[PDB]
Amino acid sequence: IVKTTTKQRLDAYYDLELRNSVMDDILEMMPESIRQKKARTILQHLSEAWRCWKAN
RNA sequence: ACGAAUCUCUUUGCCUUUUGGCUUAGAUCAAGUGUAGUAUCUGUUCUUUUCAGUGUAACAACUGAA
Numbered sequence: 001i002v003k004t005t006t007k008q009r010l011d012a013y014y015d016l017e018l019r020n021s022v023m024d025d026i027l028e029m030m031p032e033s034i035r036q037k038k039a040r041t042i043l044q045h046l047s048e049a050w051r052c053w054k055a056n
Numbered sequence: 057a058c059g060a061a062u063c064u065c066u067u068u069g070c071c072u073u074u075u076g077g078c079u080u081a082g083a084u085c086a087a088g089u090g091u092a093g094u095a096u097c098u099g100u101u102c103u104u105u106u107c108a109g110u111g112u113a114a115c116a117a118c119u120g121a122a
Contacts, residue, residue, distance in 0.1 A: 016078085039074090040073080040074080040075090044075070044076095
């Protein structure tokens with residue numbers, strides 16, 4: 001049961017694709033060894049930064 | 057003195073959930089009064105000269121002059 005993207009669940013999907021898309025880049029930049037806690041932390045910086053953009 | 061093992065200690069290094077997501081911050085909402093009375097923290101001043109009176113269980117405290 002793969003559920004299509006519709007009006008109600010649009011912007012949730014937009015979130016999900018954005019978060020993945022950022023982890024891809026930043027993980028492809030860093031040298032190597034440790035990610036996952038670091039992976040989690042980077043995304044919190046993202047969302048915080050978006051909130052800052054809305055509030056100017 | 058030296059190859060050199062083990063326990064103790066400092067440092068460098070290593071590090072743990074180093075917040076689960078999303079939207080219109082997702083939205084909205086919040087403290088009674090009066091009369092009498094006690095308890096308990098902190099701050100500030102004094103252990104500093106004699107004698108005479110008031111005072112006190114005794115001090116203390118208060119009141120005068122060298």
